[PDB]
Structures are given as C-alpha cells and as structure tokens.
RNA sequence: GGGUACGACCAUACUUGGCCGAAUGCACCAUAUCCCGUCCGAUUUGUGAAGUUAAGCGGCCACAGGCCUCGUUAGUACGGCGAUCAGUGAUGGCGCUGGAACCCGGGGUGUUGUACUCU
RNA sequence: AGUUUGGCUGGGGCGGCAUAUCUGUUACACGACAACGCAGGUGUCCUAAGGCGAGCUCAGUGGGAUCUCACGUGGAACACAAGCGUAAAUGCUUGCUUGAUUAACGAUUUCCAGUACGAAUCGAGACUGCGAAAGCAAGGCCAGCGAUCCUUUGCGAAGAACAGGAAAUAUGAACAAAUCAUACCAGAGGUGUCAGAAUAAUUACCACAGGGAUAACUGGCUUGUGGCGGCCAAGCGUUCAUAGCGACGUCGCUUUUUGAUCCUUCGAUGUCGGCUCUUCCUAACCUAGCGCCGCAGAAGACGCUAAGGGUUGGAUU
RNA sequence: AAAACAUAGGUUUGUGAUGCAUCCAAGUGGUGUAUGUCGCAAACUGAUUUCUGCCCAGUGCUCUGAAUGUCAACGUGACGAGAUUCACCGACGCGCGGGUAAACGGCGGGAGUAACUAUGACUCUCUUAAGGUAGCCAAAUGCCUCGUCUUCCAAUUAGAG
RNA sequence: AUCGAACCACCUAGUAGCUGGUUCACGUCGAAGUUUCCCUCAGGAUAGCUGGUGCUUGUUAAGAAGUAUUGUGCGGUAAAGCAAAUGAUUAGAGGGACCUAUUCUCAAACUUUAAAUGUGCAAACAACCCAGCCUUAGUUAUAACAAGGCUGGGUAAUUGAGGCACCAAGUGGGCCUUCUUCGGUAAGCGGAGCAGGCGAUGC
RNA sequence: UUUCUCGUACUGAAAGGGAGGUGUGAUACACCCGUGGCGUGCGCAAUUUGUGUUUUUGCCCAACACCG
RNA sequence: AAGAGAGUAGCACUGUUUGGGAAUGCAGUGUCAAGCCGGCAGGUAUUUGUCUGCCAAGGUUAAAUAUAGAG
RNA sequence: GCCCGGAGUCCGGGCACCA
C-alpha cells in the first residue's frame, strides 16, 4: 500500500544502462585525480619553455550584467580600442607585448 | 464464479480490540463558529475588554509588590 | 412549462436598488471562435498522419437540457442569468389562462 | 441494498398516537432554551420542518446554540471504534427539556438543606425479628386444581 | 354560592333523552340614513332596546353508550440464561429467573389561574 | 494496415437488470443487516399545481320539488409509486402577487473514508410579496440527476483622486496607439457502464497463461419426479366393504429413471453399445413345500417359507 | 481417393493499341503481346438428350439523361488600418430519371359451395416486386416418422414401386 | 523431417493482475477474509485488525469499564384482538334483498393494547451553591433577563494506569456450531442477525 | 565575509504588497529588562502541618491582534 | 569617394521536427523582395511610431572535449 | 450546427462533427 508520499518523477525510462543489449549513455570521473595532475604538468613546462614571458596576458575589468550582478566586478575578454587610444598604444602591436585586445567592447 | 456479499461477523471484536473509545470533554473543542451572529460579536466587545482588565490588575499587582520590597 | 415575459426583481446595481422591470429571453449559446486557445491548440494536434486525435463521445443518454434565462433590465443594463430544472416544453407566452 | 432515502424505516416511528393527533400546543411554544441545557431528541410528525434524521429520535444531548426558531444540540455517536459528537439543527417543536439531573440537583438541595439545619432515619428489614402468625395455613397441590387446567 | 372576558391541561370534560334556573350578565330579538358585503342585512357590518327566558348557557337525572381508575383473567400466554435433558420427530417440561393482553366485576363522570363583578 | 467488439450471473449463452436511485415488507420493538427475495416506482410535470390573507367544508347517507334541511373524526383531497401528516386546515373557492431573486466561501444532517456529488435543516445581510397585526415565504417535504480538460455566457457602467491609498480588474516581459488573445469569480453544453475509455462479427484450421474458484462422464448429500408398498373404508363384485378389487384421504421405503447441487478430479481416472467371464441381491418367471378362493374335475387368482438350480434361437434397427 | 477438383460442351462481361487486364520504390522501366476480335483478359455452370417459367421494389452494376438542388481548393469583389469576416463562381460524385436476374437474390393467406357422405371445378375476400410454372420426392433435402398402400421373408425401424 | 505465414541473427533478460521456486538459530509480540471507490468480480487504492518507535503524565484515579444500582427518555417484535378501525371469512336469530345484535375461523406488506432481551443521558473539582461587584454596540417600555469575567465564604456498586502521535507489514476466496431467520419438496443446498469456534492448535 | 544551493517570510491568477509589546488618543503620538490575554499544566520557590499559593517550561483548547 | 554575396531571405499550402506555446528548425511545390527615410533579432497574433543589438545568403583556423565490443 | 426548397411553422433534402 502506498501512503503519503511525494508524486517521484524520476526521468530515467530512456535505455542509459548499459546491459547485454544496450550500449548506455554513461560518464564516469574515475580519471579525475589524473588529470589534475595532467593540467598541472604542462602550465609548468609551458612557463619554462616561455621563460620570462608572463603566464597569462592582461585582461581589463568589466561590470557584470542584470541586476542580480550589478555590482560584482570581473574580467574581461580584452582592451577597447577607445581605451588603447587613450593610452597611445596602438592594437596590431599591443597583441605583440601580451595585452589581450578586443575589438567589439564598447565603453559606454 | 459467485461469492460472498456481506457480512458484519468479526467486526464487533475488532471494534472492541482497541476499545470504543469515550468521546471528547464537553470543554476541549467548544467555538460557536457557525451560531448567532448578533450574540457573538457582542460576546467578543466584552472579552477585548475583559483582557485589558486583566493587563491593568498584573500591574498594580506588581507594582504593590515592588513598593513593599 | 409557460413563462411569463416580464417579471419585477432586485436590480443590485447601485444605481437602481430596487425592484425593477426584467425582460425575459432564453440564451443560447455563441458561435465557436476558430481562434479560441484550445481550438488552436487542437487543430495542430489534428493535422499530420495519424488519424483521429480525442475522443468524440456517440453514448448520448439524456433527452432534456437545463433552461437559463437573461434577464435585462431597462434604466440599468445589468443582465442577470437564473436556471431553471429540466423540460421538455419551454414557452414564453406570459398569456394567463 | 435498494431505497435507502432519507426517512426508510420510519412507518411506525414517526406515526402520531391513537386519539393523540394535532399540532402542539401553547405549553410547547412557550418552553425558554438556553446554552447549557439538556434536552430530549423526539419528532413530532405534524411539523415537517426542521425534523431530526430516526437516528436521532430519543438521543439525549446538550445544546450549544439558540436561534430565533431553532436549537443546536451535540449528541454522542459510535461509528466504528470511537464516538463522534456531531451536531444538529432543528426546530423548537422536536425538542422537550430532559429531566435526567432533577435527582441529582435534588440530593444537592437536600445536603445544603440539611448543613443549614444543622447549623441552625430508617427501618432495616434485612434484620430479623419476632413473628406472630396467629395462623398458620397449608398448600397441598389439591387434585382440583389439576383437574381445572383441562380448556 | 353564581356571571362575564382571557386561559392551562384537552372526554372523570364526549353523545342521546328528560327536569329545573333568584340577581348581575350572556343570548335570542328590532331596524338599514351612514361605514361595509351579499342573488337575498340568511351570514357579515352599522345603529338600539319594544319583548322573551321558547332556544342557546348553567345545574341535576338515566342499573344509557363512551371514557378514566382499581381488581380478575394469571404467575396464564410469551421470554433471557443451562443441560452428554425427554422425544423418531413435531415439540415439551425442568433449574435460576422477567412477566402481559382482551372479555368480565367494583367505583367515578372535570380540576383550576388572572381581572371585573351580584349576595 | 492497425485496433476494439461492456459487467453481474446457482458454469457460460439467450433472457433479465438485482449497473445510479425512492416507498412498504424481509428486518429479529435504538441504529445497521443479504439473495436473478416480495409488492410497486424514478430521468418527468407545474407562472401556477409557487407565496400570502380571507371565506368555506369534504366522501357519503336520509327526508322533500339541479334546489333545500339534518347527520357526517375524514371513511375525500393534497400532479405521480407508497408510507406519514392535516378540519374555522397542509383540503376547496377567491383576491393580490413573483421569496422559484440576491444571499459577504456562516454552520450542519443523510451516504460516509466521517471524501465528493445529489437532496435537506438552522442562520446573518439586501430588496420585496400578502396581511390591521403577530406572522409566513428565499419553490411545489421527503425520488426526479453529473468531475478534470475544452467550448460558451454574465459581472469588473459613466465620472471623482498630483497618486495606487478604505475607494480605479490584471497580463501579453525594450517602449507607446488601436484591435486581438489570455487569466481571476458565478452559471450553461455530459458522460444512464450514472466517482464519468472514443468501439462490429467469426473460428470445427485454431494458439498461449491458468482454473477443479467453473460446466460435460464416475462417486457423494436429497428424493420433487420415477419405482415399490402400508392404514381407513364410499363403492364394484348374482345379495355380500375386505375371494378378488378398491375411490376421496393419509403413512412410508428404495436409489435400478430424470431433475436439484457443485464436495473430489482440468501438469488428463480413456467417454455408448455389443462380444467374453465370474460373482452378489430379491421386490419369486419356472422347479420344492404349504394355506386360501366367487377352488366340482381340469385350468387358474391370491398369500407365506424359500435365491439351492435354471431362464433360449432369429428378421429390421 | 470421395459424390471433391479438372474436363469437353453452354452462357455472360471488358476491349480497336494514346486500348483492356496488370507488375515495380523509381525511369525513354515490365507481363498477356513473336499478339490484333476465328484475339486477349475476367466470371459462372459442367458430356449428350429435352428444357431453362414469373419478379428491377432491396443491394449492386450501368446510361450518349446533367436538366436542376447540394460541395473543396483555385479565382473575383466588398467593410476594416490590418489579421479576420462576408458575398459570388466552382468539377466528378450524391440526389432525381431510365436499363439490367445464365448480377446477388426472391417466388402468399382466409371463408362458402355439386341429388348418401367425402372432396370442391365454381364464388367471395385480404394481400405482394412477383405470389413456385414445367418437372421431381419421406430423395445424400420430411420435424412429426419406425408416415400410408403394394412387393420382397416364418418374421424386415432395412431395400424397391 | 520446419507452414491458417519457412529458416538464421538481432531489437530481447520483450510483457505477464497468472503457475512454480526463494538457503542459519533462539527470543518478545501476533492477525484478516469486513467498509467505500475503481471496464471493478483470480487485481488494487482506502478504513479496520497487528508490530515498531515513542511523547505527556500518575501512584489512590485525569477525558477509565463489551458489568451492575437509582433516576429519567425511546420502541411496536413475541403474545393478544376481530364481541374495536382496514382486509378476508362461516352459520343461525329478530325486524329474497337490506338493517340490528351475535357467532366459526384469520393477516410479512392489519391493529386499540403490549412484554422479555435492549437502547440514549446523568449521578461533582477545568464543577456546583450562596454573597458583593465589573463590562457589553445582546433582549425588554426601564427593575429584570442573557453572555464574558473578578473577589469572599461551603460542598452510583467494585474493578483499575488516563490521554496523544509517527512509520509500516500481512489481509481484503473463508468455513462450522447455538439461538432467530428468508428462498427451496429437500440437500453435506443458496442468502442474512447475535455470540463462540476452526483456519493459526496441540493435549 | 563563496562563486552555487538549502534555510532564516509569507501571500495573490497577476500588476504588487509584506507581519513586536504596552500606554494615550481617534507612515497618529510617547517609551523599550521583554511571555497579547484565559484554562489545564513537569519541576522549583515560599507558607500550614497535610493543605492552600507564586512563576510556570514543553504540549493542547478557546478569544484577540498583525501581514497578503 | 564608392561598395559589401538573389529564384537568396520572406510569404501561402502540405509534411516532419522542437520545451518553443496564433506556428523552434528544416524539406517539397507555388509565389518571390529591399537597399531615397535599408534589412534581420528583441519567446502572444495584426496595423502604426520609437528604442536597443547586429549586418545573412562565400572560405580557412590550434588548445581545453570523445574513444560506450578499434588499432 | 450550415445551405436550400415546400408548407416563425414542420418536413424533405447534400453537407459538418475534440466537453
Ligand atoms: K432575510
Ligand atoms: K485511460
Ligand atoms: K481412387
Ligand atoms: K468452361
Ligand atoms: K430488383
Ligand atoms: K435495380
Ligand atoms: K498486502
Ligand atoms: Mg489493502
Ligand atoms: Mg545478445
Ligand atoms: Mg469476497
Ligand atoms: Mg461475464
Ligand atoms: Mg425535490
Ligand atoms: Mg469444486
Ligand atoms: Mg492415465
Ligand atoms: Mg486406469
Ligand atoms: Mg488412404
Ligand atoms: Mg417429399
Ligand atoms: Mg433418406
Ligand atoms: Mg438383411
Ligand atoms: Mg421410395
Ligand atoms: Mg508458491
Ligand atoms: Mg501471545
Ligand atoms: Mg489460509
Ligand atoms: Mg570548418
Ligand atoms: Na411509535
Ligand atoms: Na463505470
Ligand atoms: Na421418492
Ligand atoms: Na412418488
Ligand atoms: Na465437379
Ligand atoms: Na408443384
Ligand atoms: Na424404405
Ligand atoms: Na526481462
Ligand atoms: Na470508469
Ligand atoms: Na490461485
Ligand atoms: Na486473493
Ligand atoms: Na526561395
């Protein structure tokens, strides 16, 4: 006998199970630790072979949108072009000294 | 195939099993809900009433104690 | 069952509270839309390859219907709609016999 | 299994009387109700509105609620293996004042009647005693009597 | 000992027949200008006493019917519980116990509150 | 090509509705109580056959020429089935009316899980009807009816507010103008398998999972029917109830007929008749022994003890 | 293993090739057709002999009747700012009217009446689309039924007439 | 060796309210075959019966009882009746029908009367009685009533743990006997009411 | 003080709004050591010689009040 | 000083697909643009006016991701 | 529920069906 219960609606009538005659649709993470350590091993090759160049290029900082971010502040994809004219510096050869530029920003 | 009807055998030992229990006191659930109207709002005047007596007398009580210590 | 044509009932608008002069005329029901929701919604059911869609229900028992009455009122628009139980005979001759 | 309406076995139970018939009387109109009392449930038959369910003919309760023509009486009743007070609304006329406390409120008024004359019993046949017949009869089962009892 | 008005219980108060009734009353009775309603002042409505206790009303009576009450029917009919009771059965008695009804017989034939009132 | 082709049921089918419901009875003097139990109903009808005031008294009977007088406890009427109820009325006639409207999600009863639906009871507010008034009336007393989704109708009249307030219905999400669509509250279109799928046949060519919860054959209980007998005696027998019979009634026995039931068996107890062969019973056809007659002889009827022995050959089927 | 199927014989239907019947998912695709009405395709009956009656209301098929009523897209006009809405036109078919049974099929009751009875040629009356004609029979078709008569046996629920 | 739709591999461990199976010990408790709804009748959901976990309490009884007593209500079954209403029905008597008074015999769907066994309520402390007050927009023409409160005086046997939750199982084919009963000629037959049993249990 | 989620606030279809007590007046005014009041209530405290009383925790019943 | 991809996008009918609901993407046939106040999108259909963001119908491109019966 | 015709009236017709 059922009693008080919640209606379950649990969503899995779509053959993920993989059994003698199904494939599944399955995704496990029993390589995660390895490929931790994987990442990790080549940010440091990558920093010695570029040596002394920095490891990541500049990034500006931009607001986030809607109300619930307004006010948090992160970074962004790359410079303004208004704001590398400020600053004298021209585009084709700002990419050249690792600042990230971006052409589509706005600055309003 | 048929079968049985009904029948009210058992059902007087079950009933008893747990015994018939004795009803509510008459003082546990006893609000005039669906009433009188007329007698019920003017019975509600008098107990606002009746509660602000009742605030005023805890503070003199209170207030005769605190003089005497 | 005779029905008279006029009859003097409560208007509760607030204008005319009072007993007033109702006339009586027996309401059928309006034309389906095409573009109701539901119509909308069962007309793309419908199309494609599959056939009939819903039920269409052929077991029809009863031999009568419910009678409604709008009644309108004159100085005060105000339309007011009563049932009445099931005949077979609905008149509104309002000629006493 | 079929016809189980509202009044089903109520032939004799709602019938009036022999040479009792009528309407009621102006003692009946005249009887005051108020919150607290104990009544008895009986149908009266001559007065179609506001009669009780025959469940609830000779119940005895208390009312909770007076109304310009009617009362509300709480009446005990066993369904399966418990008892629900349930609630009734009938007219004035299926009502009679219950007379189950008057030996009760009795002793009371008697206990207060005798501290206040205080302040201000009887004979045990159980016991024995003497007993003087100054006659003494027989019984013998007689042959006659054995003899009547032939119709 | 009475009457009238308003009542409670709703036959010990009813039904048929007979006899009697001071006073205050009640009632029958007289009449249609006005208010009012009918085929008809018969009922009802408005006016007012010239008479009559004939009737209505009250009291009493009847081996009268009914009704009320107590006995008798009768510890009878019927019933709850018990038996490794009787009997082929149908049924029945026993033990511990509850207990009627009709017929019939004796008695009875309203009790009373409030107000105004004649001896 | 795909799918369907109701249920209950003394097997199933045909029949019927006991499938949603109302009265009397079954029902055992609180309440409740089953059967394909018994006798009957329901899907309607009514602007009056609803509401109120007034006046009157019905069915019937008797005496007189439709009219008149007296009696008349309801023996009439109240739409329909039945029960209950009612006499200056709950009946009949008449006059005026629309309480059959609205009714802020008030409370409750019946079924009952103390759910819904249907029906019903007691109320508070508005506007009214009939009454000189007290008062009665939100249908005709209790049977007469219907979820989700969808469709369709009614209410959110006009103005007032320097601001969304005790008072102006809301949304179509970048913003504005007019259409359109959609929401919130109250009704209507229906599901009678009536707590509510959209539905025709056949199979002997047949299949599967099961059922002795369920039929056909043996066995078991019963004995209506079938068969075989007692008791009484109105009559029949030339007169003479009983040599032999025996009506109208009543009491039994048997399980060799047919019915009634559904206990055992559906992972199977080989289902008619004949042929062959053994055995048992007696309610006795022949053979043995007795009694009696309407038994002269002969031939027979009936009855008793008796089951040791015997009871045939063929035509059509 | 038959009484079934086939058969010769008989009858009916469609069709003159840009055809009738018909295969394939499809095409400048395929079959009867290397054919041409004494042909090809589709049905029913079943040698010979002698015959093959009446019914076109029902269902079906068909018509060189479209005469008129009804209807879908496409078209043509209007009101509106537009979505929308309305009006007109609109084929075959259906309806209406003919043909057809060697298409599927169908093919009646009740009274009275002739010199002994019995039967009823004759009469009357209900009623259909038509009311079973020529033949045949208790037949492999007859419930009642082991029908009734004759023959075949001593005797026949069997056989024959 | 396969045909009212061949064979091979795969979807496929297809679904089954139906049939079969389901592996150690001891201990504490311990049922149901009944209600309502369902294309429901070999199945479910729902309440009841049961287990576990408790909570709040008490030490003579708190809101205790399958039992009595006293008081006070309810009823139309057994019986009785037809010399009383309704229905059925036999025969004489007094004035062929008719009338009056009787008479034989009756009733699940008749009744004036009316048991036994039953069935509501009450018999005190969250209460009662009296005294003096308070409030109200309730009632009454207003002393007087209603209702909610405050402050002082006095108050039916005998058995014994009361009340309140949460979570969940099995069950939803029953059968027999005593007494009361309906259908049937009857039945080891079919259908009900009360109680006790078997099922689940031996001795 | 997470960057997400559950919770500390709910309500209406929606546009939207959004909950303390006492006192005094008819987005009102003034205070803030505080159970809104009533009934039944473990334990503790204080009295009488066992009774009566205070505060009552948790829980339950019935009446306010405040938010949508 | 100019220009920036036409049986293309759109619309009608039909079919399929999507959570996409008076129609999310696509396919077939019919019809078939603008660029002198341009076109597409802004999750409820229509007509009218603003605002915001982009500029389809040509092409190439590592890293972070898969290896559900391989080497 | 539409469009007709013959007598707002009943019938005959061709159509259309999500409580
Ligand atoms: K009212
Ligand atoms: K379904
Ligand atoms: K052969
Ligand atoms: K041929
Ligand atoms: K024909
Ligand atoms: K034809
Ligand atoms: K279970
Ligand atoms: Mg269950
Ligand atoms: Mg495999
Ligand atoms: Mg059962
Ligand atoms: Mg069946
Ligand atoms: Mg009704
Ligand atoms: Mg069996
Ligand atoms: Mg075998
Ligand atoms: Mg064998
Ligand atoms: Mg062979
Ligand atoms: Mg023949
Ligand atoms: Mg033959
Ligand atoms: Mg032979
Ligand atoms: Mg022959
Ligand atoms: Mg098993
Ligand atoms: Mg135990
Ligand atoms: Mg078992
Ligand atoms: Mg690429
Ligand atoms: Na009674
Ligand atoms: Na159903
Ligand atoms: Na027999
Ligand atoms: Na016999
Ligand atoms: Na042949
Ligand atoms: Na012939
Ligand atoms: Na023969
Ligand atoms: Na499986
Ligand atoms: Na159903
Ligand atoms: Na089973
Ligand atoms: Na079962
Ligand atoms: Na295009």
Same mark, same amino acid.
């Given at each position: 006998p059922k009693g008080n219960n919640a209606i379950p609606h649990v969503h899995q009538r779509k053959h993920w199970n993989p059994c003698s005659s199904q494939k599944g649709n399955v995704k496990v993470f029993f390589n995660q630790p390895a490929q931790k350590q994987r990442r990790r091993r080549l940010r440091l090759l990558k920093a010695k072979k570029i040596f002394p160049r920095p490891l990541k290029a500049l990034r500006p900082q931009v607001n986030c949108p809607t109300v619930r971010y307004n006010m948090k502040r992160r970074l962004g994809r790359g410079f303004s072009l208004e704001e590398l004219k400020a600053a004298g510096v021209k585009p084709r050869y700002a990419r050249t000294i690792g600042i990230r530029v971006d052409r589509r920003r706005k600055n309003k | 195939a048929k079968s049985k009807n009904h029948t009210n055998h058992n059902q007087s030992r079950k009933n008893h099993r747990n015994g018939i229990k004795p009803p509510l006191p008459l003082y546990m659930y006893n609000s005039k809900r669906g009433g009188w109207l007329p007698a019920l709002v003017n019975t509600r005047r008098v107990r606002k009433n009746n509660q602000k007596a009742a605030l005023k007398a805890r503070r003199e009580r209170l207030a005769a104690h605190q003089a005497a210590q | 069952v005779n029905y008279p044509k006029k009859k003097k009932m409560h208007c509760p608008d607030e204008r005319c509270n009072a007993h007033k002069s109702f006339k009586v005329v027996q309401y059928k029901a309006g034309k389906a839309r095409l573009y109701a929701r539901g119509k909308r919604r069962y007309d793309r059911k419908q199309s =494609?390859? =599959?056939?009939?869609?819903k039920p269409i229900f052929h077991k029809k028992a009863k031999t009568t219907k419910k009678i409604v009455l709008k009644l309108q009122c004159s100085n005060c628009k105000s339309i007011i709609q009563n049932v009445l139980k099931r005949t077979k005979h609905f008149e509104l001759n309002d000629k006493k016999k | 299994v079929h016809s189980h309406g509202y009044?089903?076995?109520t032939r004799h139970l709602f019938a009036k009387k022999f040479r009792k018939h009528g309407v009621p009387s102006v003692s009946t109109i005249l009887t005051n109700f108020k919150v607290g009392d104990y009544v008895d449930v009986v149908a009266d038959a001559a007065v179609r509105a506001g009669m009780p369910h025959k469940y609830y003919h000779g119940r005895t309760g208390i009312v909770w609620n007076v109304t310009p023509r009617g009362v509300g009486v709480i009446i005990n009743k066993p369904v399966r293996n418990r008892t629900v007070r349930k609630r009734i609304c009938v007219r004035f006329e299926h009502v009679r004042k219950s007379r189950c406390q008057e030996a009760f409120k009795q002793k009371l008024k008697d206990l207060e009647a005798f501290r206040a004359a205080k302040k201000a019993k009887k004979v045990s046949t159980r016991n024995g005693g003497f007993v003087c017949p100054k006659k003494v009869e027989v019984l013998a089962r007689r042959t006659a009597d054995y003899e009547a009892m032939i119709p």
């Open positions: - | - | =494609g390859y =599959g056939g009939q869609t | 009044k089903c076995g």
